[PDB]
Amino acid sequence: EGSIGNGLDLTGILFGNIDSEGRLLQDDDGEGRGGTGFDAELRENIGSLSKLGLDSMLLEVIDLKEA
């Protein structure tokens, strides 16, 4: 009666401030169609970047497995 693999998806947390929910953000804001920040090629990939290496930096920012 439990889950397999405790911890949250912080693949984006280390990629640039994100909401543990998986929302990546940027300390600054941009209202242009292309400027400082990554386009939509990483954000949609981060949600799945936890299958090549980020897995290590994934649980390395949310050790939520000791409560």
């Binding site: 949250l8 280390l14 640039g16 300390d27 990483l42 290496g53 290590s56």
Partner: protein, 180 residues
């Protein structure tokens, strides 16, 4: 030679030294989110500096969104305060940047399949999901994203020297397998 990686953000962990009630912490926090479907912790967020953080019931919390040391040092104090401002006894210690984010352009495109064919024992490339490349620098240990566009990212470093080195280590690997 002459690019240097630019810092884009940083991530550090902090500990209040006291346990808290996520249910009340998110209910008493003016800006916090608690999703039981993602994990067992709350998520605070402030616009000064504009960063985000997630505290655990064990008091241990992680803050991200800062662009340097002083940038994160202030963001953390604010979060730790939200708890003490709510009535809890959270403290402010154990602060440390364990991940720094940087980025830069080599001015030229790189062969994603070329780097994965030379460092297959360290570089990764999935044309079925990730069109970019992920190099896991051995020392220091960091991940670098390189796209044919020439954009190079560096996250996972533990000190400004790490980000500046990770690039100085893969800088040549890319120039050796450039695309142009």
């Amino acid at each position: 030679s002459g690019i240097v990686p630019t810092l884009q953000n940083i991530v550090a962990t902090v500990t209040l030294g006291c346990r808290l009630d996520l249910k009340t912490v998110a209910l008493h926090a003016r800006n916090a989110e608690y999703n039981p479907k993602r994990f067992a912790a709350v998520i605070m967020r402030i616009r000064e500096p504009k960063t985000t953080a997630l505290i655990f019931a064990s008091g241990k919390m992680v803050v991200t969104g800062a662009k340097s040391e002083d940038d994160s040092k202030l963001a953390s104090r604010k979060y730790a305060r939200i708890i003490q401002k709510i009535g809890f006894a959270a403290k402010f210690t154990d602060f440390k940047i364990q991940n720094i984010v940087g980025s830069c352009d080599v001015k030229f495109p790189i062969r994603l399949e070329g780097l994965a064919f030379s460092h297959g024992t360290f570089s990764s490339y999935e044309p079925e999901l990730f069109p970019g490349l992920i190099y896991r620098m051995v020392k220091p240990k960091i991940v670098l994203l390189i796209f044919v566009s020439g954009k190079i990212v560096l996250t996972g470093a533990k000190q400004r020297e790490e980000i500046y080195q990770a690039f100085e280590a893969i800088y040549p690997v890319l120039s050796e397998f450039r695309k142009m």
